[PDB]
Amino acid sequence: TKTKIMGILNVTPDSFSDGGKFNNVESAVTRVKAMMDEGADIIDVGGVSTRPGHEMITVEEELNRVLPVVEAIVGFDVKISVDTFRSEVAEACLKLGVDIINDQWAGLYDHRMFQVVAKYDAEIVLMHNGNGNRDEPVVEEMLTSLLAQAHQAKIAGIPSNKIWLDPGIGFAKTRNEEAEVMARLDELVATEYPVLLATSRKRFTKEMMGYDTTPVERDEVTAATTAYGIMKGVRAVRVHNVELNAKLAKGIDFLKENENARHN
Template sequence: MRHPAGLPAPLALLDRTLVMGIVNVTPDSFSDGGKFFSPEQAIAHALMLVEQGADLVDVGGESTRPGAAEVDSDEELHRVLPVVTALVGQGVPVSVDTRHAVVAHKCLDAGAAVINDVSGGLGDAGMYATLATKTAPYILMHNRSLGASDDQLANYDDVLSEVVAELQSRIEAARASGIAADAIVIDPGLGFAKKAHHNWSLLEPDALKAINSLGFPVLLGASRKRFLGTHPDGSSRPIDSMQARDELTVEITARAVDAGIWAVRVHEVAANAELVRSLG
């Protein structure tokens, strides 16, 4: 397994796909907004995910669902920094889901291990410069806008080749700003400026292997996203529940493991952790 430089030693020694558990410290995330909004709730949830088999947890303080209100960096820090500090103090590897450079900087100083930027550097002009001064892995996601599921921007002649080209452009910008190439993780951005069939196309085995062949570790985040309520042709599934989406997520994790994907980002950790360990 190819790991990014700067990943903590216990994780970097694992020779399999990692499981990243989602901890939303938000009132309005699409699947669990408000459930873990207090620091105490978020910390307890994160520890439960680790107990269930999460290798690291991804702590976020701003919802990226369509129509969600933007959160400024001060409020985001108020939400996530106590959680990050407490988890680091208990030895939990923490990724921080943020598009704000100041949040990334302060959370890394508090001991966070990874920065997960859903804007791919488009959300804050200072993000690349901040990460260039650090040694932590930087997850750079494909995104054409700051909002998720922006159908106006979901125009592709060939979704795989265009996503790859746009990721390569952002990688070049990140490297030009001083971020080390071996610290970069890429994410194809499922659910962001993509229609349902685009997402399913990116999840085809050959597409996953093509993305994974770019020379960077890959994070895949399909969990509970809207497109899971559809078939690959875009038609609606007769049953679309969180349980059904969680079951589909496990199937996608199996594809990810087969393609050699670095990590999967999931809400329901136990089933995915069991799968990745069984597949090795």
């Protein structure tokens, strides 16, 4: 019943600070152990990004990045999610025992993703992305798309309670469109598919600050979106600062449950 805390484990070569000195399985294991200790329920491993202007890699390459890391941590007492939009990458990871496939394309890139996730009795996160030049209201477009994709997921045999929806904050959306989405999370929660909110250190949180910040300085306004989102009913949050959010979410979860209990 708790809000799930999904930590971020980025394994793309370029995201590494010290020239990639610590871009290996052993470093990833130290990081994951820290995130588990701070309260992470899920570790989101990703080696690709669907953002425009990014590196375009092969399935073999993505597998090179993700497989060794997944194998090393899948045995830990934490759930494992993989950010991938290609079913071949998903299947290899599912065979290694991952729990969730976080598809930044909501199965739009590769429709086999649905039967692949279902074949392994896993969960799938469908993120709203693309169609940035849409002419209709973003939340309507988002709901139409995500609901069509979730329906495809159910057809493949994926249970409704194992199909997550993610607004895709940070992807194919203007500042106006993101403001609209953040104001209507209740509508997304109303679909009854568990909702994953992922705003951590992105432009939206960057612009909630009154000055230019380094990513880490956006942690408190990210926690604000976490608390707000839980109040709206989102079921999980994807964050960089696992501890802050884990402890804050424990508080909000407590307060909401206490409130429901006391109003029967």
